[PDB]
Amino acid sequence: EMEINDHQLSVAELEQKYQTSATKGLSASLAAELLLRDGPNALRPPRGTPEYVKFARQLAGGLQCLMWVAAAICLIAFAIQASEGDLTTDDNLYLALALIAVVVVTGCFGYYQEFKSTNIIASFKNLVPQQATVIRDGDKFQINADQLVVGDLVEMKGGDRVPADIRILQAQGCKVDNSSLTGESEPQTRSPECTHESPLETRNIAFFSTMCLEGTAQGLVVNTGDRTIIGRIASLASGVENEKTPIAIEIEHFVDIIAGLAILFGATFFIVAMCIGYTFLRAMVFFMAIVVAYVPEGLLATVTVCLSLTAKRLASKNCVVKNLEAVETLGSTSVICSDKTGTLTQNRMTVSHLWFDNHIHSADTTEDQSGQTFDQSSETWRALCRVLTLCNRAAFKSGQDAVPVPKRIVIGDASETALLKFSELTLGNAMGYRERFPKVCEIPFNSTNKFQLSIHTLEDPRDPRHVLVMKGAPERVLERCSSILIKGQELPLDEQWREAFQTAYLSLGGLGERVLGFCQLYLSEKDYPPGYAFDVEAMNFPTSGLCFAGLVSMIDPPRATVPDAVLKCRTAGIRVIMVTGDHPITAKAIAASVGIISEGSETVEDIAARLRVPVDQVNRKDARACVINGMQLKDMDPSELVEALRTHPEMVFARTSPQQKLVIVESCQRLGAIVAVTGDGVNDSPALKKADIGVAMGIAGSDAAKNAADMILLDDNFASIVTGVEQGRLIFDNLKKSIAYTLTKNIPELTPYLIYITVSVPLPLGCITILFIELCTDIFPSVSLAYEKAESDIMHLRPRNPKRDRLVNEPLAAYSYFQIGAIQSFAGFTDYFTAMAQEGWFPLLCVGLRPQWENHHLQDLQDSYGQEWTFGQRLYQQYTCYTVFFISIEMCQIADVLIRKTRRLSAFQQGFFRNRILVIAIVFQVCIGCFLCYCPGMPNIFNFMPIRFQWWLVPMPFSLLIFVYDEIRKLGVRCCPGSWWDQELYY
Amino acid sequence: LGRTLSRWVWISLYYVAFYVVMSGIFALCIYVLMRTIDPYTPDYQDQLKSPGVTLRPDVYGEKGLDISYNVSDSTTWAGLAHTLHRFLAGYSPAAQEGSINCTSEKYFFQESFLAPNHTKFSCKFTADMLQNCSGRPDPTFGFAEGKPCFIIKMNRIVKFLPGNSTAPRVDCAFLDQPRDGPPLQVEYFPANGTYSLHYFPYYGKKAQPHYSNPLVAAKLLNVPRNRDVVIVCKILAEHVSFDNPHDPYEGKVEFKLKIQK
Numbered sequence A: 001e002m003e004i005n006d007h008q009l010s011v012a013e014l015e016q017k018y019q020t021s022a023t024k025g026l027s028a029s030l031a032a033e034l035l036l037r038d039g040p041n042a043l044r045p046p047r048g049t050p051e052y053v054k055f056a057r058q059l060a061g062g063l064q065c066l067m068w069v070a071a072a073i074c075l076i077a078f079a080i081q082a083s084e085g086d087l088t089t090d091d092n093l094y095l096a097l098a099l100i101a102v103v104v105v106t107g108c109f110g111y112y113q114e115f116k117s118t119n120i121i122a123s124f125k126n127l128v129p130q131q132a133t134v135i136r137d138g139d140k141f142q143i144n145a146d147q148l149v150v151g152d153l154v155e156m157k158g159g160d161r162v163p164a165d166i167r168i169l170q171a172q173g174c175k176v177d178n179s180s181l182t183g184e185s186e187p188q189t190r191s192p193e194c195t196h197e198s199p200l201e202t203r204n205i206a207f208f209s210t211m212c213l214e215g216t217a218q219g220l221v222v223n224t225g226d227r228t229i230i231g232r233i234a235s236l237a238s239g240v241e242n243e244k245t246p247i248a249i250e251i252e253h254f255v256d257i258i259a260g261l262a263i264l265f266g267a268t269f270f271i272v273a274m275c276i277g278y279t280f281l282r283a284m285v286f287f288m289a290i291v292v293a294y295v296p297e298g299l300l301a302t303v304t305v306c307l308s309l310t311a312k313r314l315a316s317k318n319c320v321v322k323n324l325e326a327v328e329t330l331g332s333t334s335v336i337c338s339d340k341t342g343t344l345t346q347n348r349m350t351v352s353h354l355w356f357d358n359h360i361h362s363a364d365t366t367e368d369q370s371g372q373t374f375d376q377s378s379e380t381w382r383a384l385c386r387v388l389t390l391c392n393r394a395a396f397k398s399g400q401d402a403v404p405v406p407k408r409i410v411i412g413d414a415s416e417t418a419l420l421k422f423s424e425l426t427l428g429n430a431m432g433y434r435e436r437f438p439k440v441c442e443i444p445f446n447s448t449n450k451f452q453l454s455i456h457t458l459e460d461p462r463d464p465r466h467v468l469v470m471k472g473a474p475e476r477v478l479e480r481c482s483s484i485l486i487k488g489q490e491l492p493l494d495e496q497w498r499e500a501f502q503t504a505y506l507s508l509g510g511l512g513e514r515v516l517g518f519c520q521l522y523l524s525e526k527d528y529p530p531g532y533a534f535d536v537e538a539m540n541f542p543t544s545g546l547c548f549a550g551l552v553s554m555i556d557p558p559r560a561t562v563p564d565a566v567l568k569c570r571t572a573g574i575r576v577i578m579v580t581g582d583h584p585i586t587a588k589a590i591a592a593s594v595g596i597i598s599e600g601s602e603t604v605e606d607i608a609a610r611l612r613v614p615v616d617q618v619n620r621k622d623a624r625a626c627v628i629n630g631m632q633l634k635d636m637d638p639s640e641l642v643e644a645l646r647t648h649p650e651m652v653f654a655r656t657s658p659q660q661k662l663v664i665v666e667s668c669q670r671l672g673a674i675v676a677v678t679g680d681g682v683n684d685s686p687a688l689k690k691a692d693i694g695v696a697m698g699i700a701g702s703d704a705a706k707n708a709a710d711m712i713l714l715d716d717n718f719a720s721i722v723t724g725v726e727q728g729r730l731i732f733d734n735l736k737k738s739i740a741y742t743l744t745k746n747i748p749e750l751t752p753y754l755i756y757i758t759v760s761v762p763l764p765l766g767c768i769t770i771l772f773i774e775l776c777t778d779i780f781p782s783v784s785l786a787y788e789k790a791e792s793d794i795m796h797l798r799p800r801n802p803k804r805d806r807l808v809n810e811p812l813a814a815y816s817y818f819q820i821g822a823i824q825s826f827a828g829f830t831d832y833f834t835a836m837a838q839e840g841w842f843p844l845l846c847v848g849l850r851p852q853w854e855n856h857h858l859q860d861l862q863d864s865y866g867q868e869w870t871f872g873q874r875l876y877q878q879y880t881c882y883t884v885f886f887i888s889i890e891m892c893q894i895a896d897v898l899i900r901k902t903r904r905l906s907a908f909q910q911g912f913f914r915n916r917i918l919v920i921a922i923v924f925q926v927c928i929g930c931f932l933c934y935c936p937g938m939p940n941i942f943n944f945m946p947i948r949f950q951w952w953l954v955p956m957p958f959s960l961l962i963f964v965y966d967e968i969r970k971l972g973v974r975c976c977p978g979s980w981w982d983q984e985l986y987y
Numbered sequence B: 001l002g003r004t005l006s007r008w009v010w011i012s013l014y015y016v017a018f019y020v021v022m023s024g025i026f027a028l029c030i031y032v033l034m035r036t037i038d039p040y041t042p043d044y045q046d047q048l049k050s051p052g053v054t055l056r057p058d059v060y061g062e063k064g065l066d067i068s069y070n071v072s073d074s075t076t077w078a079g080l081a082h083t084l085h086r087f088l089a090g091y092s093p094a095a096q097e098g099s100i101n102c103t104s105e106k107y108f109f110q111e112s113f114l115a116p117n118h119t120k121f122s123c124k125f126t127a128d129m130l131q132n133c134s135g136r137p138d139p140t141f142g143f144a145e146g147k148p149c150f151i152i153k154m155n156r157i158v159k160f161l162p163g164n165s166t167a168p169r170v171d172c173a174f175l176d177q178p179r180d181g182p183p184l185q186v187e188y189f190p191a192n193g194t195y196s197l198h199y200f201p202y203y204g205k206k207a208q209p210h211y212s213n214p215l216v217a218a219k220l221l222n223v224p225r226n227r228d229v230v231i232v233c234k235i236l237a238e239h240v241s242f243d244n245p246h247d248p249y250e251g252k253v254e255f256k257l258k259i260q261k
């Protein structure tokens, strides 16, 4: 870009290259010409997103490319028929129109459910401009970050967001928040010297998104907008392309299963149809008729609404998904790669442990205050609490009485803010407590003095004397403390107490944490009266000999839900891996703190620490956990990495760049892993895009991370995720309940026609009617099967093996078509011939009859009783054979939906009335079937007539045949789940 | 390359047995379904709320009955007559032997099944009752003239009963063409264009194996030449519908007619 040299440059060389000055900045005339030259200092969004071509992609896919092929074959068939002059060629134009109408209205449904998904994301995003304090023509003032141009001179301070990529020139104790780019939760020191040649490790550059915590600095802009470090991570994260979702894989799997049957059924019944001696035009037009019945015109609809009800279920729990496929993905997901800083943690310095009264107390670290706080009963605390509260200069922004204290904005340092929040919660109205002990002398934290300190007058007026409070680097608090508060009294700081403060300081340093000492001293109102004048440079007060209060320590803590959430996913068969750009010590801590690394497991560097060997001679397998730092990961040929990954089951990756994050997911996806990543900052966006489902904190998340992610958690409730797996496995189980239902009936939609081809009986079932099944009668049942519950304890299973456990397969496929569809076919043919014989046509006569039946030029054909019917009366019986094959299906299909409720358990055991949505659906199924027959004019409008209430009941002894074949199937598969019968008769 | 070989058969035989199980259930159902229904009378016969009537000779072009012929050209009506002959080839008194010369001149309820092999009895309609359109004297049934005869027939329904008042006649007319010349005129055989009432009602192709439909003709005298007309032949009874829209052959026959000179 332009930067890999910039930090190594001299001020003479820099202000030459960008034609500026390190003191005065740009001339306004030139900073305007550069803004035109380089555009605005922001990030071009993924510029190409036309509204119409969003709808375009809502129309391709597994099922849709099938319907199109079928829709085309409906038009190829229609022309073929009218070319040799065929009548009611409507029925080819009705299926083509319905096939295309279904794929269209599905494309609309999702289009809004993205618009509304992406407007609710646009709702949660902040749109007030970030700001820079700039210098131009030697004038300091405020502007917006976006008008910064390459070469400008700016300033920063505690609170201001870093407005560009900036080179440091002078730094006064400047610390910064890098957790968006690096995983570094620790603040980072900024200084104008060249620490490195890679500008991500050097200290003399500030990055475009980062947050300045405490201190102040000044420097020059070196790259603006996309050309920043920030901007070039989305450029890769845009360059990343994401994989096809697991559910879409399982769709195009069975699309190819469906096609395979249509083809052979067309070909065989074309080769069959040629041996009945047809026209080649017609042995093959049936071929096309055959393949098109095998398309369920309405399965695409039932899936999209099944997903919507789970998509909506999640949305109610503050969990937004962009496209409905990812709704499933969590359930089938088997690996979670998780960002630490900002994702597993709160990314907030919180007070964790304290030392006083010779005891290491641990506080409540959580955001909602659900945890377990410490003993505040003793005197040493109230003094220690007074010290930390009074020796604190940070301040809350006004009007924050509502928001929980952890989520409030404080004008102050990193350490000072954490204590202020801690002081505010533990004591209550911290700001007002220290106001009533009026401050009269103060010393800033210092390079030469190395501590903070203040002296105060006291609360009640009957005490006229003063008190001094001091905190700082604990060893610099101890050299000047000769007295310690202990158990009420104030004791001498002897060699018991000297060696006991150094063990604790380095004990809490052992947890990586940042810790300060706190101390106090009461001054005499004789030497130091009301009206005394304290001077600093003349040390007219004690800078030594103080009474020690205690230590207080801070750390980046996990989010309250996270540790529970982590260990519920592990118990659901999902390995977790931390992928964090923080240093390996904080990594292992949070890893054990939440349950990435379990209580009682070790890295190889703990075995060689316990056994005290060199690490050289330790066994790898015996270490349950391992930590790999980002730069030793380079040395690893991936096949080394695969040895390590399945050998150390609890893995932790430290100091990993956005590139390595992507790699680790890629290395897992290469091993048949459905893996999801979770992140906040831009370091996650690449791996957030590569993942099978990327998840982004809707609050703590950077824009590129949320853009690249497929799912967003707006409440930042990490435990929203586990509710996702339960869903993703629910619909998965519940889809192969819903899908198996809508597929069975295609066979008794085809067999009446297949028999019609080869036996030439009067047409049993019409494409005017087979659509009313496909697209009206059987929809409410199929989508109710979303509301099936677990049968097992769904959350206590492994994720689905992608290869063995599929959405449909040869066992589930053959059972639904060729066994259940056969019974529904026999159920129709029986109800067919009854209507025939009972209205006049003997089944034996129905053989080969069709030629004269549909013949328009006969008007007096003799039935078996010798009665002569006109064509327009044979019509109304071929309509009755429609209506009678139709009700045969409905009485059979009402049995089909109940028996998919339960895939292993007996519907006795689970229940009949179980799914109250599934019950309400079926009343809808018979009610439209009643309207379709006995409404006035229904004979002519569609091909249905008021049928006699005898033919209703003829299929009912086939309906209840079905219930007791699958019952003794899932009674025999639960009672005898052995080898033979558990594979064949199970789906 | 698929599943287990020696157990592929162990399910391939199952599918076999599964299908013979279902086919036999079916086989029982049709055996019952046949031994359910009556072998002389239809159980419901629902779409037969009125009988179709059916003209001869039947020639359709597109869109329905289109009868066009040029009298001078023998070939234009040679097959039209030949069908009328080979149709009445069963209406010969020779072929119509197993029947009786009905006299009743009113309804004929046979409640008693007395005949060869427990059959029943049937009346007679031999060609001669059409008397002019019977192929004798004119084997062209008036086609050679320009006054062709069209045999009109009614569909036969078991135990259907059309009424008492008169005999059920026919009546053939234009679809009104009033201003253009006189109203149509036709003579019918036998008189008044009536099917005698003693031919009803039907007791099924099983009870009456030797049965034939009663006939009338319609010799077309008034007809103008080289001109397209349409002729409806509505039947005039009380148990009959002739205006049902979704089946216009219910109780009538329409046909385009062009007699060319």
Ligand SMILES: CCCCCCCC/C=C\CCCCCCCC(=O)OC[C@H](COP(=O)(O)OCC[N+](C)(C)C)OC(=O)CCCCCCC/C=C/CCCCCCCC
Binding pocket: A751, A755, A759, A821, A822, A825, A826, A829, A842, A843, A844, A845, A847, B019, B023, B024, B026, B027, B030, B031, B034, B035, B036, B037, B038, B039
């Ligand atoms: C993929 C596998 C497909 C395999 C399908 C095979 C189905 C074959 C099953 C049964 C066939 C019937 C067996 C016939 C023997 C049974 C007894 C019998 O003889 O009964 C009598 C009837 C005729 O009665 P009648 O006039 O003599 O009685 C006198 C009338 N009285 C009683 C009123 C006086 O015999 C008859 O009709 C003879 C004609 C039988 C009816 C023809 C029906 C054709 C329709 C076939 C569709 C089958 C369903 C396919 C579903 C496959 C789904 C994948």
Ligand SMILES: Cc1cn2cc(C(=O)N(C)CCO)cc(N[C@@H]3CCOc4cccc(C)c43)c2n1
Binding pocket: A073, A074, A077, A078, A088, A091, A092, A095, A285, A286, A288, A289, A290, A292, A293, A749, A750, A753, A763, A765, A766, A767, A768
């Ligand atoms: C499996 C199947 C059953 N079917 C029934 C009907 C039907 O009952 N009706 C109302 C009209 C016919 O009687 C129409 C179909 N139409 C399909 C549409 C796809 O392509 C073709 C191509 C060639 C021929 C056809 C017939 C068809 C059809 N297919």
Ligand SMILES: *[C@@H]1O[C@H](CO)[C@@H](O)[C@H](O)[C@H]1NC(C)=O
Binding pocket: B070, B071, B072, B073, B226, B260, B261
């Ligand atoms: C009728 O047929 C004769 C002989 O085939 C022919 O000469 C005459 O032109 C025809 N009349 C009409 C109107 O076509």
Ligand SMILES: *[C@@H]1O[C@H](CO)[C@@H](O)[C@H](O)[C@H]1NC(C)=O
Binding pocket: B101
């Ligand atoms: C007409 O009926 C007579 C009864 O008088 C019957 O004997 C005869 O068979 C019929 N006529 C002829 C010519 O057979």
Ligand SMILES: *[C@@H]1O[C@H](CO)[C@@H](O)[C@H](O)[C@H]1NC(C)=O
Binding pocket: B131, B132, B137, B187, B219
């Ligand atoms: C019927 O035939 C007779 C003689 O065959 C004839 O006199 C009579 O006129 C014919 N009928 C008509 C309507 O011409």
Ligand SMILES: [Mg+2]
Binding pocket: A179, A180, A181, A182, A183, A339, A340, A341, A342, A343, A679, A680, A681, A682, A683, A684
């Ligand atoms: Mg982050």
Ligand SMILES: [Rb+]
Binding pocket: A292, A293, A294, A295, A297, A749, A770, A774
């Ligand atoms: Rb279909």
Ligand SMILES: [Rb+]
Binding pocket: A361, A362, A363, A364, A372, A373, A374, A375
């Ligand atoms: Rb505690």
Ligand SMILES: [Rb+]
Binding pocket: A242, A243, A688, A689, A690, A691, A692, A693, A694, A708, A709, A710
């Ligand atoms: Rb993705």
